[PDB]
Amino acid sequence: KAGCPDNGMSEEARQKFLEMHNSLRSSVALGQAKDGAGGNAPKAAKMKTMAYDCEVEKTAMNNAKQCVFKHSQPNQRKGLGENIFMSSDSGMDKAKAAEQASKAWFGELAEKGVGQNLKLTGGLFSRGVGHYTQMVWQETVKLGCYVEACSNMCYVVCQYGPAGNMMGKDIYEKGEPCSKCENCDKEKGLCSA
Ligand SMILES: [Co+2]
């Protein structure tokens, strides 16, 4: 979602990825997101707005173009986190793929649960909610994704800068929406720079 190269990724898909990420981060920040562990995820005091980044898309593309479903190694995406997703519908619309990937990742919260302790402990890290926690990582403010049509799958990779899912760190700071940032609408809960 914007000024990126004509590289096979659709603008519609870029826009959908960013829109979904910010919308879902907002829902969490406002205390509106159901948590499988009980109640809703806690409100966030300074959930940051994401922007789309063409350079992050470039390293996401390096993974997706391989048409093998797997996480890239850290040095193949220096300083970035990563979520991956696949569908058997190889030729599906890329915007539709963006929506499905974003929902599947976010769904870990409702389905597996996270709870009110947002410190990324070894326990939490091992419960398989790492796609969700990366989507709502407070300090992650750059998003870049690529969707590749492969022989047997539609393969989706998003990368995230700076990387989230840092062990021992909080996913986000708890508090009333906007309570710890200036450029923020109390009814949205997202902080801009
Ligand atoms: Co993963």
Side-chain angles (χ1 to χ4, degrees), residues 69 71 82-84 105 108 128-131 165:
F69 183 85
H71 275 296
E82 182 181 76
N83 286 343
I84 64 179
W105 296 335
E108 290 167 352
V129 294
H131 305 101
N165 290 357

PDB file of all heavy atoms in Angstrom, residues 69 71 82-84 105 108 128-131 165, ligand 1:
ATOM      1  N   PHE A  69       6.221 -24.143   1.580  1.00  0.00           N
ATOM      2  CA  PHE A  69       5.641 -23.614   2.811  1.00  0.00           C
ATOM      3  C   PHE A  69       6.581 -23.793   4.000  1.00  0.00           C
ATOM      4  O   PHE A  69       6.720 -24.895   4.541  1.00  0.00           O
ATOM      5  CB  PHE A  69       4.291 -24.274   3.087  1.00  0.00           C
ATOM      6  CG  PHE A  69       3.591 -23.746   4.299  1.00  0.00           C
ATOM      7  CD1 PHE A  69       2.800 -22.612   4.222  1.00  0.00           C
ATOM      8  CD2 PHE A  69       3.712 -24.389   5.521  1.00  0.00           C
ATOM      9  CE1 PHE A  69       2.154 -22.130   5.338  1.00  0.00           C
ATOM     10  CE2 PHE A  69       3.064 -23.909   6.641  1.00  0.00           C
ATOM     11  CZ  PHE A  69       2.286 -22.773   6.548  1.00  0.00           C
ATOM     12  N   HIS A  71       8.959 -21.209   7.218  1.00  0.00           N
ATOM     13  CA  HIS A  71       9.553 -19.972   7.673  1.00  0.00           C
ATOM     14  C   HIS A  71      10.934 -19.796   7.078  1.00  0.00           C
ATOM     15  O   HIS A  71      11.699 -20.753   6.956  1.00  0.00           O
ATOM     16  CB  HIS A  71       9.618 -19.938   9.197  1.00  0.00           C
ATOM     17  CG  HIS A  71       8.358 -19.447   9.832  1.00  0.00           C
ATOM     18  ND1 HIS A  71       7.889 -18.161   9.651  1.00  0.00           N
ATOM     19  CD2 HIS A  71       7.459 -20.069  10.628  1.00  0.00           C
ATOM     20  CE1 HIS A  71       6.762 -18.010  10.322  1.00  0.00           C
ATOM     21  NE2 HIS A  71       6.479 -19.152  10.924  1.00  0.00           N
ATOM     22  N   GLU A  82       7.964 -12.713  10.849  1.00  0.00           N
ATOM     23  CA  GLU A  82       7.316 -13.324   9.691  1.00  0.00           C
ATOM     24  C   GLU A  82       6.103 -14.176  10.058  1.00  0.00           C
ATOM     25  O   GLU A  82       6.130 -14.924  11.041  1.00  0.00           O
ATOM     26  CB  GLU A  82       8.338 -14.189   8.952  1.00  0.00           C
ATOM     27  CG  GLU A  82       7.836 -14.860   7.676  1.00  0.00           C
ATOM     28  CD  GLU A  82       8.915 -15.714   7.052  1.00  0.00           C
ATOM     29  OE1 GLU A  82       9.161 -16.827   7.579  1.00  0.00           O
ATOM     30  OE2 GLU A  82       9.529 -15.274   6.057  1.00  0.00           O
ATOM     31  N   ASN A  83       5.044 -14.050   9.257  1.00  0.00           N
ATOM     32  CA  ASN A  83       3.912 -14.960   9.302  1.00  0.00           C
ATOM     33  C   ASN A  83       3.774 -15.602   7.934  1.00  0.00           C
ATOM     34  O   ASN A  83       3.983 -14.936   6.914  1.00  0.00           O
ATOM     35  CB  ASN A  83       2.617 -14.221   9.640  1.00  0.00           C
ATOM     36  CG  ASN A  83       2.539 -13.809  11.094  1.00  0.00           C
ATOM     37  OD1 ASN A  83       3.272 -14.318  11.933  1.00  0.00           O
ATOM     38  ND2 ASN A  83       1.629 -12.890  11.402  1.00  0.00           N
ATOM     39  N   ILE A  84       3.425 -16.886   7.902  1.00  0.00           N
ATOM     40  CA  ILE A  84       3.176 -17.565   6.633  1.00  0.00           C
ATOM     41  C   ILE A  84       1.806 -18.248   6.626  1.00  0.00           C
ATOM     42  O   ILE A  84       1.270 -18.609   7.674  1.00  0.00           O
ATOM     43  CB  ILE A  84       4.282 -18.598   6.293  1.00  0.00           C
ATOM     44  CG1 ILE A  84       4.306 -19.722   7.323  1.00  0.00           C
ATOM     45  CG2 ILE A  84       5.642 -17.924   6.205  1.00  0.00           C
ATOM     46  CD1 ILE A  84       5.363 -20.778   7.021  1.00  0.00           C
ATOM     47  N   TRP A 105      -4.309 -15.910  10.959  1.00  0.00           N
ATOM     48  CA  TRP A 105      -3.298 -15.502  11.922  1.00  0.00           C
ATOM     49  C   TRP A 105      -3.945 -14.894  13.158  1.00  0.00           C
ATOM     50  O   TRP A 105      -3.628 -15.272  14.293  1.00  0.00           O
ATOM     51  CB  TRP A 105      -2.344 -14.498  11.285  1.00  0.00           C
ATOM     52  CG  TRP A 105      -1.554 -15.070  10.149  1.00  0.00           C
ATOM     53  CD1 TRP A 105      -1.239 -16.388   9.939  1.00  0.00           C
ATOM     54  CD2 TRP A 105      -0.990 -14.341   9.055  1.00  0.00           C
ATOM     55  NE1 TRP A 105      -0.498 -16.513   8.781  1.00  0.00           N
ATOM     56  CE2 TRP A 105      -0.331 -15.271   8.226  1.00  0.00           C
ATOM     57  CE3 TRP A 105      -0.957 -12.987   8.711  1.00  0.00           C
ATOM     58  CZ2 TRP A 105       0.329 -14.891   7.059  1.00  0.00           C
ATOM     59  CZ3 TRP A 105      -0.300 -12.608   7.552  1.00  0.00           C
ATOM     60  CH2 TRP A 105       0.332 -13.558   6.738  1.00  0.00           C
ATOM     61  N   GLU A 108      -5.857 -17.025  16.118  1.00  0.00           N
ATOM     62  CA  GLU A 108      -5.182 -17.756  17.183  1.00  0.00           C
ATOM     63  C   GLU A 108      -5.598 -17.228  18.547  1.00  0.00           C
ATOM     64  O   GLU A 108      -5.689 -17.990  19.512  1.00  0.00           O
ATOM     65  CB  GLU A 108      -3.663 -17.711  17.010  1.00  0.00           C
ATOM     66  CG  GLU A 108      -3.178 -18.530  15.807  1.00  0.00           C
ATOM     67  CD  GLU A 108      -1.736 -18.262  15.425  1.00  0.00           C
ATOM     68  OE1 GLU A 108      -1.119 -17.330  15.983  1.00  0.00           O
ATOM     69  OE2 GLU A 108      -1.219 -19.000  14.554  1.00  0.00           O
ATOM     70  N   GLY A 128       1.706 -21.712  20.338  1.00  0.00           N
ATOM     71  CA  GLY A 128       1.332 -21.597  18.940  1.00  0.00           C
ATOM     72  C   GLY A 128       0.406 -20.435  18.648  1.00  0.00           C
ATOM     73  O   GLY A 128      -0.538 -20.553  17.858  1.00  0.00           O
ATOM     74  N   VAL A 129       0.674 -19.300  19.283  1.00  0.00           N
ATOM     75  CA  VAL A 129      -0.111 -18.096  19.031  1.00  0.00           C
ATOM     76  C   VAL A 129       0.776 -17.000  18.460  1.00  0.00           C
ATOM     77  O   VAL A 129       0.421 -15.821  18.494  1.00  0.00           O
ATOM     78  CB  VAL A 129      -0.828 -17.590  20.299  1.00  0.00           C
ATOM     79  CG1 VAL A 129      -1.883 -18.582  20.735  1.00  0.00           C
ATOM     80  CG2 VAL A 129       0.158 -17.331  21.420  1.00  0.00           C
ATOM     81  N   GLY A 130       1.912 -17.413  17.907  1.00  0.00           N
ATOM     82  CA  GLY A 130       2.917 -16.496  17.397  1.00  0.00           C
ATOM     83  C   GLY A 130       2.560 -15.704  16.156  1.00  0.00           C
ATOM     84  O   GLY A 130       3.196 -14.687  15.874  1.00  0.00           O
ATOM     85  N   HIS A 131       1.565 -16.155  15.397  1.00  0.00           N
ATOM     86  CA  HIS A 131       1.129 -15.360  14.257  1.00  0.00           C
ATOM     87  C   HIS A 131       0.280 -14.194  14.758  1.00  0.00           C
ATOM     88  O   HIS A 131       0.477 -13.047  14.339  1.00  0.00           O
ATOM     89  CB  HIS A 131       0.376 -16.212  13.231  1.00  0.00           C
ATOM     90  CG  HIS A 131       1.153 -17.397  12.748  1.00  0.00           C
ATOM     91  ND1 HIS A 131       0.935 -18.673  13.226  1.00  0.00           N
ATOM     92  CD2 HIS A 131       2.147 -17.501  11.837  1.00  0.00           C
ATOM     93  CE1 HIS A 131       1.761 -19.512  12.628  1.00  0.00           C
ATOM     94  NE2 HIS A 131       2.503 -18.828  11.776  1.00  0.00           N
ATOM     95  N   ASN A 165       7.730 -10.760  18.666  1.00  0.00           N
ATOM     96  CA  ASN A 165       7.954 -12.066  19.252  1.00  0.00           C
ATOM     97  C   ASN A 165       9.344 -12.180  19.842  1.00  0.00           C
ATOM     98  O   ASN A 165      10.000 -13.221  19.722  1.00  0.00           O
ATOM     99  CB  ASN A 165       7.675 -13.177  18.237  1.00  0.00           C
ATOM    100  CG  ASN A 165       6.188 -13.308  17.921  1.00  0.00           C
ATOM    101  OD1 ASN A 165       5.363 -12.604  18.506  1.00  0.00           O
ATOM    102  ND2 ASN A 165       5.842 -14.200  17.002  1.00  0.00           N
TER     103      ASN A 165
HETATM  104 CO    CO B   1       4.841 -19.619  12.520  1.00  0.00          CO
END
